[PDB]
Design a protein around this ligand. Structure first.
Ligand code: HEM
Ligand code: HEM
Ligand SMILES: *[C@@H]1O[C@H](CO)[C@@H](O[C@@H]2O[C@H](CO)[C@@H](O)[C@H](O)[C@H]2NC(C)=O)[C@H](O)[C@H]1NC(C)=O
Ligand SMILES: *[C@@H]1O[C@H](CO)[C@@H](O[C@@H]2O[C@H](CO)[C@@H](O)[C@H](O)[C@H]2NC(C)=O)[C@H](O)[C@H]1NC(C)=O
Ligand SMILES: *[C@@H]1O[C@H](CO)[C@@H](O)[C@H](O)[C@H]1NC(C)=O
Ligand SMILES: *[C@@H]1O[C@H](CO)[C@@H](O)[C@H](O)[C@H]1NC(C)=O
Ligand SMILES: [Ca+2]
Ligand SMILES: [Ca+2]
Ligand SMILES: [Ca+2]
Lengths: 288, 143, 141, 225
C-alpha cells in the first residue's frame, strides 16, 4: 500500500509511499511532518483585530512563575521561538537555561498546555534577544495549532506589512483575554535607531527612548511602526512572530520575533529581531 | 456581584438626568477619538479622521443613541446582565469581531462623559457604582 | 505617541489645572481606591478613608510628578526615571493599576474642568497619561 | 453543465444529512469553512425542502468519502445553487473528510416542543427536539415574547405567559436553543432569531421554561404580617 497521513501534514520520504519492502528505499517506513505556516483560516497589543477565527496557530502563550503572560512562536512541530528577556522573567541575570525550563508554562491553541522539555538561549542573547523552547513531545498540528515557517528570504524590506499576533497587554494594560493581532509595517531602519539612540553613529548615540528602557538595536533587528490607527504592541507581546504573508506561494513566514514590547504606544517603533539572522542558529539547534 | 441598594439608587438618580439623545453619541465619539482603532468598525459611518468630524457625524450620534439605550436596558436589569446582553454579545463576537476590551474602554469613556456632564455630582461613590455597572455590562457583553 | 498638538493640549489643560493639582490628585487617588479596591493593596500603610491627609499628600506628590512630566513632555523618561525605577522595582506596581489611575485622573479632570475637556483635549490627556504610565511601567518585570 | 445532482447522505431522510454534490462523474462533499445559515438556506431551497433549520460541519452526520468540491464559499443567502457563490475554485480545498458540512432542512426536520417537570401541562421546563434528541433552552434572552410564542406553539391557554420553569430541576442532554428573540408573531420557536443550534454559553441551571395560563389561576397574597 501507499503511506499517506492526514491533513496539515506532508509526507517526509524519498520515493512515493508504495510498499513490507519499498522498491525505492527499502524499509524506511517514513514519518510525515507538519506543514509550514498554512493556517486553516488565515487573517486579513493595544489595537483591535480580534483573532476570532484562530488565524495565528503559531502563537503560543508563555506565562512565567510570577504570572506575566508573554509570547512564543511555533517554528516547527516541537520547538518554539521566544525572546531571551521572556525566558529570564523572574530569574537572575546569572541564571542558566536548565532551571528556566521548569519555571515556564506554555499554552498553544485555545488553552492546550504543553510541557517544556528544555530551553536553549541564543549564545549572544545580549545582542540577539532569542531563546528556543523545546516541547517534551511534538504538538498535534490542527486548525488551532500549527508552526509558522522560517523565511527563505528577507521580508523585512521597508514598507512590508506583517501581522503581529500577541497575548500581551492591551489599552487598559490588562493581559488580553483573547488573542489579538495588528498589521504593523516595517519602518526605515535609520528612523528607528534615530528614534531610540541618538544619530545611528556609535559616538553620538544617546538613550533617547520615549519609553524608559532601551531596545536591542543592531544588524540582527528590524523595526515595525504602529499601524494606521496608532496601535502597537505592548508588554507581553515579546516573542510573537512578525508573521509576513507571502502572496506568491500563500505561506506565512516569521520574518521577525518581537523583542522590544515596551513600545506600547509611546515609542513609535517596535523592535523585531530578524529570524533570517537567527535561522542558521535555530536549525543547528533543531539538529541536537 | 450584587449591587447594594444605595449604589443602585445613586446610579438610577444619576441616570435619570442623562440626555439619552446626546450622552451616548458623545461617549461613542470620544471612544472613536481617543482610541482610533475603534474607528475600524465604523468605516461605513463616513468621515472619522478629525475629532470634530467624529463628534459631528450624524451616524455616530445615532449609533451612540442606540448604545446608550442598550446601556439603559442593562441598567434596568442590573441583576440579569448576561441574559439581557446575550444577543448583543453574540453580535459583537461573531458578526462584528469586536474585542471585549473595547467594551471596557467604552465603559470608561462613558464614565468620563458622565463626569464631564455632571461635574462634582459625579462623586467617587457614584463613580464606583458606575464602574461596577460598566464592568458588569462589559463582562456580560464579552466572550 | 504624543503629537505636538497633543503636547500643546496637555500643556494647556494642565496649566488650567494649575494650583488645584494637589486636590485633583487626591480626588483621583480616592476614586481609584473606591472604584478599584484592588489598587489599595499597594497602600497597606495608608489611611484610605475619605478626606485622608495622607492620601491628600500622596495626591499632591502625584500631581507634582505629573506637572514635572508636563514641563518635560519631550524628556519624560528622564523626568520620571526615579519614579520609573521606584514603581517598577521597589513597589512592583502592576501596569493595570497605572491605567486605572490614569482613567481616574481623566475622570477628575472631566468633573472639574468640563469646559476644557474637549474630545481632542481628552484624547491628548489620555495619550499623556498613557505615556506617563508606560514610562513608569517600562522597567516592570 | 447545469446537471449537478445534489444529495444528502446519512441524515435520516432526504432533506437532512451531509451535503454531497456529483460533478465530473464523481460524488463530492463540501467543507464547513465559512459555513453559516446562508449556505444552509441555499442547500435547502436546492432540494425544495423549505427553510434552513440549522447547519452542521463537525461531521456529525458521518465521515465523507470523495473529492471535496467546495472549501470556502461566500453566500449572502439568495443563490440559485451552491455552485454560484465564491467557491474559491473547484476541487481545491484544505480540508479532510472530517470537515465535511451537513445541513438540516425544515421539511425533513422533526422539530418539536414539549413541557416536562411542571405543575401543569402548560408550565415547566421547556424542551425542544433537534435531530430527534430532546434538549433544553437557555434562559438568556428568554423574555415574555418567547414565552408567548412557546405557549401558542404548544397549545393551551396563553392569555398570561411567564418565563421560568416551574419547580423544574436542571435538564439533561443538550442545550439546543439559546438567545431566542421572538417578536410574538412567529408560528413556532425556531422561526425566531437565535443562536446556532447546539451552540450556547449556558449551563443546565439556566434552562428556560414557560408558564402558560389564562390568568384565573394566578393568586398573590401577603403572609406573615
Ligand atoms: C460597551 C457597550 C456597548 C453597547 C451596550 C453596544 C450596543 C450596541 C447596539 C445596541 C448595537 C445595535 C445592534 C443592531 O443594530 O442590531 C450595536 C452594534 C454595533 N456595535 Fe456596539 N455597543 C457597545 C460597544 C461597542 C464598541 C466598543 C464598538 C467598537 C469598538 C462597537 C461596535 C459596534 C458596531 C460596528 C455595531 C454595528 C453598526 C451597525 O449596525 O451599523 N460596539 N452595539
Ligand atoms: C500617573 C501615574 C502615577 C504617578 C504620576 C505616580 C507618582 C508617584 C510619586 C511622585 C510618588 C512619590 C515617591 C517619592 O516621593 O519617593 C509615588 C509613590 C508611590 N506610588 Fe505612585 N504614581 C503613579 C501611579 C501609581 C499607581 C497606579 C499606584 C498603585 C496602584 C502607585 C503606587 C505608589 C506607592 C505605593 C507609592 C509609595 C508611597 C509611599 O510609600 O508613601 N503609583 N508615586
Ligand atoms: C519571582 O516572583 C516572586 C513573587 O512575585 C518573588 O517573590 C517575592 O519577592 C519579594 C522581593 O524579594 C518579596 O518581598 C516577596 O515576599 C516575595 N513573594 C513570595 C516569595 O511569594 C521573587 O523574588 C521573584 N524572583 C525574582 C525577582 O528573581
Ligand atoms: C412540580 O409540582 C408538580 C405538582 O405538584 C409535581 O407533579 C406531581 O409530582 C408528584 C410526585 O412528586 C406526583 O405524585 C403527582 O402526580 C404530580 N402531579 C402532576 C400534576 O404532575 C412535580 O413533580 C413538581 N416538580 C418537581 C418537584 O421538580
Ligand atoms: C500565579 O497564578 C497562580 C494561579 O493561576 C497562583 O496559584 C500562583 O500563586 C501565582 N503566582 C504568583 C507568584 O503570584
Ligand atoms: C555570536 O557572536 C560571534 C561573534 O560576535 C559569532 O561568531 C557567533 O556566530 C555568534 N553566535 C551565533 C549563534 O551566531
Ligand atoms: Ca473547518
Ligand atoms: Ca478553507
Ligand atoms: Ca441566564
Amino acid at each position: 500500500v501507499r503511506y499517506q497521513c492526514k491533513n496539515y501534514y506532508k509526507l517526509r520520504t524519498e520515493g512515493d509511499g508504495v510498499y513490507w519492502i519499498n522498491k525505492a528505499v527499502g524499509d524506511k517506513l517514513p514519518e510525515c511532518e507538519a506543514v509550514c505556516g498554512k493556517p486553516k483560516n488565515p487573517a486579513n497589543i493595544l489595537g483591535g483585530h480580534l483573532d476570532a477565527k484562530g488565524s495565528f496557530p503559531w502563537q503560543a502563550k508563555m506565562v512565567s512563575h510570577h504570572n506575566l503572560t508573554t509570547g512564543a512562536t511555533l517554528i516547527n512541530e516541537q520547538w518554539l521561538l521566544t525572546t531571551a528577556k521572556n525566558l529570564f522573567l523572574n530569574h537572575s541575570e546569572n541564571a542558566t537555561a536548565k532551571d528556566i525550563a521548569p519555571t515556564l508554562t506554555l499554552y498553544v491553541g485555545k488553552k492546550q498546555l504543553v510541557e517544556i522539555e528544555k530551553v536553549v538561549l541564543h549564545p549572544n542573547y545580549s545582542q540577539v534577544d532569542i531563546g528556543l523552547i523545546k516541547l517534551k513531545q511534538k504538538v498535534s498540528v490542527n486548525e488551532r495549532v500549527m508552526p509558522i515557517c522560517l523565511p527563505s528570504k528577507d521580508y523585512a524590506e521597508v514598507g512590508r506589512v506583517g501581522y503581529v499576533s500577541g497575548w500581551g497587554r492591551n489599552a487598559n494594560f490588562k493581559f488580553t483575554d483573547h488573542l489579538k493581532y495588528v498589521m504593523l509595517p516595517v519602518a526605515d531602519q535609520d528612523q528607528c535607531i534615530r528614534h531610540y539612540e541618538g544619530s545611528t553613529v556609535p559616538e553620538k548615540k544617546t538613550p533617547k527612548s520615549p519609553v524608559g528602557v532601551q531596545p536591542i538595536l543592531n544588524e540582527h533587528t528590524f523595526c515595525a511602526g504602529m499601524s494606521k490607527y496608532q496601535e502597537d504592541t505592548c508588554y507581553g507581546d515579546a516573542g510573537s512572530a512578525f508573521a509576513v504573508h507571502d502572496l506568491e506561494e500563500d505561506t506565512w513566514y516569521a520574518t521577525g520575533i518581537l523583542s522590544f514590547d515596551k513600545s506600547c504606544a509611546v515609542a513609535e517603533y517596535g523592535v523585531y529581531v530578524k529570524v533570517t539572522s537567527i535561522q542558521d542558529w535555530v536549525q543547528k539547534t533543531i539538529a541536537e | 456581584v450584587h449591587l447594594t441598594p444605595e449604589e443602585k439608587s445613586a446610579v438610577t438618580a444619576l441616570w435619570g438626568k442623562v440626555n439619552v439623545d446626546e450622552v451616548g453619541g458623545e461617549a461613542l465619539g470620544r471612544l472613536l477619538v481617543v482610541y482610533p482603532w475603534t474607528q475600524r468598525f465604523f468605516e461605513s459611518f463616513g468621515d472619522l479622521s478629525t475629532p470634530d468630524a467624529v463628534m459631528g457625524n450624524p451616524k455616530v450620534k445615532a449609533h451612540g443613541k442606540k448604545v446608550l439605550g442598550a446601556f439603559s436596558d442593562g441598567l434596568a436589569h442590573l441583576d440579569n446582565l448576561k441574559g439581557t446582553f446575550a444577543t448583543l454579545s453574540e453580535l459583537h463576537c461573531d458578526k462584528l469581531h469586536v474585542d471585549p476590551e473595547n467594551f471596557r474602554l467604552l465603559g470608561n469613556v462613558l464614565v468620563c462623559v458622565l463626569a464631564h456632564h455632571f461635574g462634582k455630582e459625579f462623586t467617587p461613590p457614584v463613580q464606583a457604582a458606575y464602574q461596577k455597572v460598566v464592568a458588569g455590562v462589559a463582562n456580560a457583553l464579552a466572550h | 505617541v504624543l503629537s505636538p498638538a497633543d503636547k500643546t493640549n496637555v500643556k494647556a489643560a494642565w496649566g488650567k489645572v494649575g494650583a488645584h493639582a494637589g486636590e485633583y490628585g487626591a480626588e483621583a487617588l480616592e476614586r481609584m481606591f473606591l472604584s478599584f479596591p484592588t489598587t489599595k493593596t499597594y497602600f497597606p500603610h495608608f489611611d484610605l478613608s475619605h478626606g485622608s491627609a495622607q492620601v491628600k499628600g500622596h495626591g499632591k506628590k502625584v500631581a507634582d510628578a505629573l506637572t514635572n512630566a508636563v514641563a518635560h513632555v519631550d524628556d519624560m523618561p528622564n523626568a520620571l526615571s526615579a519614579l520609573s525605577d521606584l514603581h517598577a522595582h521597589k513597589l512592583r506596581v502592576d501596569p493595570v493599576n497605572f491605567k486605572l489611575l490614569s482613567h481616574c485622573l481623566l475622570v477628575t479632570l472631566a468633573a472639574h474642568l468640563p469646559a476644557e475637556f474637549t474630545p481632542a483635549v481628552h484624547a491628548s490627556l489620555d495619550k499623556f497619561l498613557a505615556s506617563v504610565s508606560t514610562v513608569l511601567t517600562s522597567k516592570y518585570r | 453543465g447545469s446537471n449537478l445532482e445534489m444529495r444528502l447522505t446519512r441524515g435520516g431522510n432526504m432533506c437532512s444529512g451531509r451535503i454531497e454534490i456529483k460533478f465530473q462523474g464523481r460524488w463530492g462533499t463540501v467543507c464547513d469553512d465559512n459555513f453559516n445559515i446562508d449556505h444552509a438556506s441555499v442547500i435547502c431551497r436546492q432540494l425544495e425542502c423549505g427553510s434552513a433549520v440549522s447547519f452542521s460541519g463537525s461531521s456529525n452526520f458521518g465521515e465523507g468519502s470523495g473529492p471535496i468540491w467546495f472549501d470556502d464559499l461566500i453566500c449572502n443567502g439568495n443563490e440559485s445553487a451552491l455552485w454560484n457563490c465564491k467557491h474559491q475554485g473547484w476541487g481545491k480545498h484544505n480540508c479532510d473528510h472530517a470537515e465535511d458540512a451537513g445541513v438540516i432542512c425544515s421539511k425533513g426536520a422533526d422539530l418539536s416542543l414539549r413541557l416536562v417537570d411542571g405543575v401543569t401541562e402548560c408550565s415547566g421546563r421547556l424542551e425542544v427536539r433537534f435531530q430527534g434528541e430532546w434538549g433544553t433552552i437557555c434562559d438568556d434572552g428568554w423574555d415574555s415574547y418567547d414565552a408567548a410564542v412557546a405557549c401558542k406553539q404548544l397549545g393551551c391557554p396563553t392569555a398570561v405567559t411567564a418565563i421560568g420553569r416551574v419547580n423544574a430541576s436542571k435538564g439533561f442532554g443538550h442545550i439546543w436553543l439559546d438567545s431566542v428573540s421572538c417578536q410574538g408573531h412567529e408560528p413556532a420557536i425556531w422561526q425566531c432569531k437565535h443562536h446556532e443550534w447546539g451552540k450556547h454559553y449556558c449551563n443546565h441551571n439556566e434552562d428556560a421554561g414557560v408558564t402558560c395560563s389564562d390568568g384565573s389561576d394566578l393568586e398573590l397574597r401577603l403572609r406573615g404580617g
